[PDB]
Design a protein around this ligand. Structure first.
Ligand SMILES: CC(=O)O[C@H]1C(=O)[C@@]2(C)[C@H]([C@H](OC(=O)c3ccccc3)[C@]3(O)C[C@H](OC(=O)[C@H](O)[C@@H](NC(=O)c4ccccc4)c4ccccc4)C(C)=C1C3(C)C)[C@]1(OC(C)=O)CO[C@@H]1C[C@@H]2O
Ligand SMILES: Nc1nc2c(ncn2[C@@H]2O[C@H](COP(=O)(O)OP(=O)(O)OP(=O)(O)O)[C@@H](O)[C@H]2O)c(=O)[nH]1
Ligand SMILES: Nc1nc2c(ncn2[C@@H]2O[C@H](COP(=O)(O)OP(=O)(O)O)[C@@H](O)[C@H]2O)c(=O)[nH]1
Ligand SMILES: Nc1ncnc2c1ncn2[C@@H]1O[C@H](COP(=O)(O)OP(=O)(O)O)[C@@H](O)[C@H]1O
Ligand SMILES: [Mg+2]
Lengths: 440, 431, 345
């Protein structure tokens, strides 16, 4: 049976983690105590799924998760919250102090003293596994833990495990909104290391999900408890073919192969088009054509970067629910007729499809509606080459005055590391420009 | 478990702390017998910051009280919340500083700082993990300046990897309460600028104007003024004692608010401050609080932020909110008022939210701003200083207790070499 | 415009490197210095105002020990007699060619033996009964932002290297309280003093070579010139002083690749903070010698603070950056070149 280890870091990954397991425990019938009152129906079978939950001989289901935060505020809310009886007590609070939004604290200085506890806890987790295929790291571009500890842990897992998928879900830093002055630095320092190890980093942007929650869900005052659920639905759409039956099943190494041409351009965006409420659940028929057209609207992306300021390289439409492949064929035919959606000359196919017969679940306390079908579009795009340029421009000013650098030097970073990290980024915009040029 | 050692030296510090330990208790449900008579259960979780456990489920605060006289120490005991402080921590002496910085730093403070460090090492080594030290003192009274700065130096020599956040009342422009405020303030600046991480500049005239224009208070005693400083001191440590959607702490705020290690002097501020009658006429929302906190009238530093550029602002929100609203508002401020912000630092604002607000508010806020306008406060003292030093007026009381003119020249030079650093980011130019 | 001049030197392969056929990763276009990876994917180009190709002994433009002195340090020896201060810095990592360039070998001397022979020779050719020249010196170290003297023996104990204090005299400027200021007549004195100091310096064995400089070393020469334009009354009234500092800085040492805890880490932090401030200062100085108004943060490191009057003003600064041409040590070289580029910018 397949297995996938989930590794949550920082306030953002741990808080995003709270929504993913809240969703999966409902998709599988598990209560927060770990028990499972669905087995009385069948008395056997595999309604529990070893891709996420290991099972004891007592009738309890334990997730394959590790929550490392280097601070106790968020993992204590799980230890006291509604899900205290689900997680194995080894949730690494550790955390005498946090990383203070500093790569230099989460990487070496305070990242040490805790990582060997994480790798030991991860080593225990893959020895209980038969068919381990992949890691799922949920972190944040901009923090200190989510920037440095992820880098360290990936550098260590590439050594230990090696030929294993490693998919990142990161909160991309937004152009306008920001909650810190040291996000550009930490982002460009995380990429420097993660780019040589990771295999596909799915980016999300809170400024986009805010506008989505505004225009489509009709929430004028949204918070993070609502966006984390959308992200849970994304990961549920990726992690569906490993749990539920379907027609075109998509394993995790398929994302590693049908979306990354070259081993540096692996930062695709993400969508989930039926983001409608129960009010507008009616007045809409929710067919594949409407959805596939929505996924390529510039608005309904979970990241803020116009796909029309660049070209598409690869796309991946994970369908779930009642879908017949003629509908997807017609949908994809409709996009190729459209000129706004422009494709690289070196990818005439450009699309992937994956269909699954289990539709998405509705959480109580949720803003999304019940739908007989749903879709997740994960696209690679040259548009991000601007976003990268924006971050580089933000880095170029502050580092021209050595602002905030003594806070990094004070915890074990050299000046040349900042310059070495910038160089690696200049050499990633040139790659996108090199990919956009037409053949001759 | 992140832990703060609170030190408070001098009548200003002793009478701000005496209000701070009255507020944190109310926030944690502790009584003057050190018991626990609260209702919620998040209080006891992270109470280890300020308080220490005792035998009968009693909580003693980590106060270290070192006023150089005996009157202030006696007032705290013969007082509301005085029967919880550790008796072996009421450190004092007789015949205080004499409004002299030197007596509190060389003559009469050197005979008493060892006895204080005996308590610091005894309340720090009883910690699983320490975050930093929290001083509340005055600039312009000798003892607070002197015996505070020497203590800062000794702790930053013993504990150099820890925060030393200071809450300092600065002298006011129009009217003074000592004729040697300039000298003592400069000499304390020379020992704080080099040995601090986040200093919070407070001024009593701005507090009087707050009490007058906003709270519609015409007889405000110092208890009313310290009631606002307690509020800010509390809000800095809310995301270390209560959960939140977006957490911070002393070091995160320091990292975000100090580009270069000497610009750690901040205008503080707190919202929602309102008159008792005008509270049924306005809505409690984030736009109201943003319009209150970014106003020059709610400063507590006696400096107009429109006479300069905000280098780096912060915001420690408290309550159930929507982080979109905070992000939108702290973007609108930086888009509209671009001239009041700095161009080489794209996002000048930090945000932080907690889920547990104060005892009677549906949401609160707190504000820390690094601004070039603070140079005014310094530019004034150096103008006073250089006058009184050009004629050696009140110096035969500073030299008598073992000092040189060099210690005045050095400090005056450092002050102007901070004015310069604040004024290098204060010109209206374009890219 | 030449308020600051940064020069870089490429030391030739070591005999072991020659035996190992270590790839060459630094090349010349005469002036440019290009650094090509062993993979040859990305190539990095640096340009400075002075470059010293000392890799071969046949290349047109070979910079020996006499092309270094004649190009960087002798103009500072001649900006002294005009009464104006000078500074020389030396940056580089272990194996880069710092000591070969500054001090040198017995067969091949560096800057210090040549400076302290040419100066005493110019004094044997300019001193008359009218004009007279006097030289003093000191030799101190920075260790975790604490000054320490090196030309004094210890007090026969486990640990005692006394921390001294920096103070701002109102007219002259920063200075040290307790600094030995010994007189000197020829190089035979400077050699003994330096040999006594460099053995009391701080040098540890981390995961690198087992002798790593964990301290900055400053070495001063105060030249006072007295002149008698005779008029009946008091004579030898004129007095012009010139400080000639010859500083030898330490290496950056990133801590991830060189796993350190405790004291070694605290040394690395200081060594990097100081160099950050120094590069910021050297940037901001040329930024004001090129038509601007800025502030120089002298007051962030004890080195930039005490050399305040010898770095800026009418002073003249020179700096040598040493780099290796092998692929075994290539991030050290990239960081070294990047530091000097920031200086030049
Ligand atoms: C129904 C109602 O709205 O009453 C409010 C009230 O009128 C106002 C004006 C309160 C009132 O505060 C003042 O009147 C005041 C006067 C001088 C100086 C400072 C405050 C209030 O006393 C203050 C008090 O605020 C609190 O409850 C907090 O817990 C506050 N309390 C204390 O600081 C405190 C001090 C000693 C002992 C116990 C508590 C607090 C604020 C920040 C951090 C921690 C605690 C409350 C609800 C009010 C009254 C009672 C009128 C305000 O207080 C603050 C700082 O939040 C003043 O403006 C705010 C807005 C409130 O609406
Ligand atoms: N979508 C989402 N984003 C979040 C959440 N919490 C924080 N973030 C984002 O994370 C960014 C800050 O990173 P943090 O996670 O706070 O940093 P960290 O990983 O917690 O590391 P620390 O420095 O130790 O706190 C901000 O830009 C937030 O928008 C969340 O619950 N959901
Ligand atoms: N905000 C506030 N400021 C005070 C208070 N008491 C004194 N001050 C200020 O602090 C200074 C008093 O100095 P102080 O340390 O008490 O003198 P000392 O007793 O000789 O050490 C004056 O400049 C006052 O402006 C108070 O209760 N509240
Ligand atoms: N330009 C050069 N020509 C010849 N040898 C050199 C040159 N530069 C460095 N070396 C050699 O490098 C060796 C060791 O380097 P060293 O001078 O000790 O630098 P460091 O003191 O920083 O280790 C010396 O034995 C010296 O011969
Ligand atoms: Mg955190």
């Amino acid at each position: 049976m397949r297995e996938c280890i989930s590794i949550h870091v920082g306030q953002a990954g741990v808080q995003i983690g709270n929504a993913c397991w809240e969703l999966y425990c409902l998709e599988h019938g598990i209560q927060p105590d770990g028990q499972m009152p669905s087995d009385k129906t069948i008395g056997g079978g595999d309604d529990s799924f070893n891709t996420f939950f290991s099972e004891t001989g007592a009738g309890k289901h334990v997730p394959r998760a590790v929550f490392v935060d280097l601070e106790p505020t968020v993992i204590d809310e799980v230890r006291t919250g509604t899900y205290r009886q689900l997680f194995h007590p080894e949730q690494l609070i550790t955390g005498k102090e946090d990383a203070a939004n500093n790569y230099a604290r989460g990487h070496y200085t305070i990242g040490k003293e805790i990582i060997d506890l994480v790798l030991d806890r991860i080593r225990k987790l893959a020895d209980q596994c038969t068919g381990l295929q992949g890691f799922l790291v949920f972190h944040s571009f901009g923090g200190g833990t989510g920037s440095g500890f992820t880098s360290l842990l990936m550098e260590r897992l590439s050594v230990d495990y090696g030929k294993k998928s490693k998919l990142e879900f990161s909160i991309y830093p937004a152009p306008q909104v920001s909650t810190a002055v040291v996000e550009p630095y930490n982002s460009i320092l995380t990429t420097h290391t993660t780019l040589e190890h990771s295999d596909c980093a799915f980016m999300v942007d809170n400024e986009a999900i805010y506008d989505i929650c505004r225009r489509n869900l009709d929430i004028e005052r949204p918070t993070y408890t609502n966006l984390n659920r959308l992200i849970s639905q994304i990961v549920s759409s990726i992690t569906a073919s490993l749990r539920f039956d379907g027609a075109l099943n998509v394993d995790l190494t398929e994302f590693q192969t049908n979306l990354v041409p070259y081993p540096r351009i692996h930062f695709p965006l993400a969508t989930y088009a039926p983001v409608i409420s129960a009010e507008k659940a009616y007045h809409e028929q929710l067919s594949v054509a409407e959805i596939t057209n929505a996924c390529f609207e510039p608005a309904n992306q979970m990241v803020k970067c116009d796909p029309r300021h660049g070209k598409y390289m690869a796309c991946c439409l994970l369908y779930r629910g009642d879908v017949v492949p003629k509908d997807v064929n017609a949908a994809i035919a409709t996009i190729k007729t459209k000129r706004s959606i422009q494709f690289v000359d070196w990818c005439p196919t450009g699309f992937k499809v994956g269909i699954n017969y289990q539709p998405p679940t509705v959480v109580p306390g949720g803003d999304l509606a019940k739908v007989q079908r749903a879709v997740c579009m994960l696209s690679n795009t040259t548009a991000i080459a601007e976003a990268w340029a924006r971050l580089d421009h933000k880095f170029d000013l502050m580092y021209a005055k050595r602002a905030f650098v003594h806070w990094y030097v004070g915890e074990g970073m050299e000046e040349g590391e900042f310059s070495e990290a910038r160089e690696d980024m200049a050499a990633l915009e040139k790659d996108y420009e090199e990919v956009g040029v037409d053949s001759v | 478990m992140r832990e703060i050692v609170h030190i408070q030296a001098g009548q200003c510090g002793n009478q701000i702390g005496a209000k701070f330990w009255e507020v944190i208790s109310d926030e944690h449900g502790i009584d003057p017998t050190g018991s626990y008579h609260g209702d919620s259960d998040l209080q006891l979780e992270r109470i280890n910051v300020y308080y220490n456990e005792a035998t009968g489920n009693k909580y003693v605060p980590r106060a270290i009280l070192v006023d150089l006289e005996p009157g202030t120490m006696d007032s705290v005991r013969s007082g509301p919340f005085g029967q919880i402080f550790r008796p072996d921590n009421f450190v004092f002496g007789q015949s205080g500083a004499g409004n002299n910085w030197a007596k509190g730093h060389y003559t009469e403070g050197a005979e008493l700082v060892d006895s204080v460090l005996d308590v610091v090492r005894k309340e720090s080594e009883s910690c699983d993990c320490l975050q930093g030290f929290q001083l509340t003192h005055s600039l312009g009274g000798g003892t607070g300046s002197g015996m505070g700065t020497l203590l800062i130096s000794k702790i930053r020599e013993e504990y150099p990897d820890r925060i030393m956040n200071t809450f300092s009342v600065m002298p006011s422009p129009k009217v003074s309460d000592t004729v040697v405020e300039p000298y003592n303030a400069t000499l304390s600046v020379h020992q704080l600028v080099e040995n601090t991480d986040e200093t919070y500049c407070i001024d009593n005239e701005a507090l009087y104007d707050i009490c007058f224009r906003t709270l519609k208070l015409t007889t405000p005693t110092y208890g009313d003024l310290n009631h606002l400083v307690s509020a800010t001191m509390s809000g800095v440590t809310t995301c270390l004692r209560f959960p939140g959607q977006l957490n911070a702490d002393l070091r995160k705020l320091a990292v975000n608010m100090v580009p270069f290690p000497r610009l750690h002097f901040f205008m503080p501020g707190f919202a929602p401050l309102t008159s008792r009658g005008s509270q049924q006429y306005r809505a409690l929302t984030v736009p109201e609080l943003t319009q209150q906190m970014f106003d020059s009238k709610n400063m507590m530093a006696a400096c107009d932020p429109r006479h300069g550029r905000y280098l780096t602002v912060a915001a420690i929100f408290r309550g159930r909110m929507s982080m979109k609203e905070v992000d939108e508002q702290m973007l609108n401020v930086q888009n509209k008022n671009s001239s009041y912000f700095v161009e080489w630092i794209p996002n000048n604002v930090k945000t932080a939210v907690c889920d547990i607000p104060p005892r009677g508010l549906k949401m609160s806020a707190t504000f820390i701003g690094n601004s070039t306008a603070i140079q005014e406060l310094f530019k004034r003292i150096s103008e006073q200083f250089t006058a009184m030093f050009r004629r050696k007026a009140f110096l035969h009381w500073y030299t008598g207790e073992g000092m040189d003119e060099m210690e005045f020249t050095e400090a005056e030079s450092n002050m102007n070499d901070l004015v310069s650093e604040y004024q290098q980011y204060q010109d209206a130019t374009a890219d | 415009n030449s308020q600051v001049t940064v020069a870089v030197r490429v030391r030739p392969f070591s005999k072991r490197e020659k035996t190992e056929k270590a790839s060459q990763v630094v090349f010349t276009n005469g002036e440019e210095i290009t650094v090509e990876h062993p993979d040859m994917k990305q190539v990095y180009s640096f340009i400075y105002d002075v470059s010293f190709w000392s890799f071969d002994e046949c290349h047109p433009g070979y910079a020996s020990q006499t092309t270094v002195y004649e190009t960087l340090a002798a103009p500072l020896l001649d900006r002294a007699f005009e009464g104006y201060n000078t500074c020389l810095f030396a940056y580089g990592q272990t194996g880069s060619g710092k000591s070969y360039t500054m001090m040198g070998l017995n067969e091949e001397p560096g800057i210090i033996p040549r400076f302290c022979e040419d100066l005493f020779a110019q004094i044997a050719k300019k001193q008359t009964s009218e004009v007279s020249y006097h030289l003093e010196m000191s030799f101190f170290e920075v260790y975790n932002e604490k000054i320490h003297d090196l030309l004094v023996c210890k007090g026969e104990n486990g640990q005692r290297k006394q921390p001294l204090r920096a103070r701002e005299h109102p007219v002259s400027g920063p200075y040290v309280e307790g600094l030995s200021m010994n007189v000197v007549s020829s190089y035979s004195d400077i050699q003994s003093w330096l040999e006594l100091g460099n053995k009391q310096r701080a040098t540890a064995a981390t995961g690198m070579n087992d002798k790593s400089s964990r301290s900055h070393s400053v070495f001063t020469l105060v030249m006072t010139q007295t002149k008698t334009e005779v008029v009946e009354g008091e004579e030898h009234d004129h007095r012009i002083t010139s400080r000639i500092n010859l500083v030898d800085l330490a290496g950056s040492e990133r801590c991830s690749t060189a796993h350190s805890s405790g004291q070694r880490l605290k040394e690395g932090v200081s060594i990097n903070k100081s160099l950050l401030t120094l590069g910021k200062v050297i940037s901001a100085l040329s930024e004001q010698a090129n038509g601007k108004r800025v502030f120089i943060p002298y007051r962030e490191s004890t080195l930039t603070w005490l050399l305040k009057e010898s770095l800026g003003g009418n002073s003249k600064t020179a700096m040598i950056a040493t780099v290796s041409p092998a692929a075994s040590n290539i991030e050290e070289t990239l960081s070294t070149l990047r530091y000097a580029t920031q200086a030049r910018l």
